[PDB]
């Protein structure tokens, strides 16, 4: 997962400190399936 080391280096040197994108609907649906598929 995640971006490559070459990208992480590029982004920090050229743009800034990357932050997370939050999708609660992706997260919560996957949390529910964690419970369902146990």
């Amino acid at each position: 997962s995640g971006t490559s080391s070459a990208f992480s280096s590029y982004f920090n040197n050229k743009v800034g400190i990357p932050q997370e994108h939050v999708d609660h609907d992706d997260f919560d649906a996957n949390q529910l399936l964690n419970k369902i598929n146990e």
């Binding site: 997962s1 490559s4 982004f11 743009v15 400190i17 990357p18 939050v22 992706d26």
Partner: protein
Amino acid sequence: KRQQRFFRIPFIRPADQYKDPQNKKKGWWYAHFDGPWIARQMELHPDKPPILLVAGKDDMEMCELNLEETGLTRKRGAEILPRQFEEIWERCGGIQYLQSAIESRQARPTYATAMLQNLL
């Protein structure tokens, strides 16, 4: 149209890196990849004008890595719908910026230039 992929990375200034949340002013980085290569790059900053960059003209300033070597397709929540890129691009004056790089012959031909030239 199917080889077109769009990515977004929220960021904060490296100057606010170690500050409290309320002092971290957010911006957004966007990339449009036409197959393996970035056609358009866009940056929304909290403290300065938006940066627009197109392949050909802005090669030295843009991300140099192809899609596979960025790892963006492996970063969860990074990918966005075409519309999420275009809406911002348009609001930032991206159409006038692309059109100008075409006319000055600085732009590399991409899916993005083709779409604009179809309009004109």
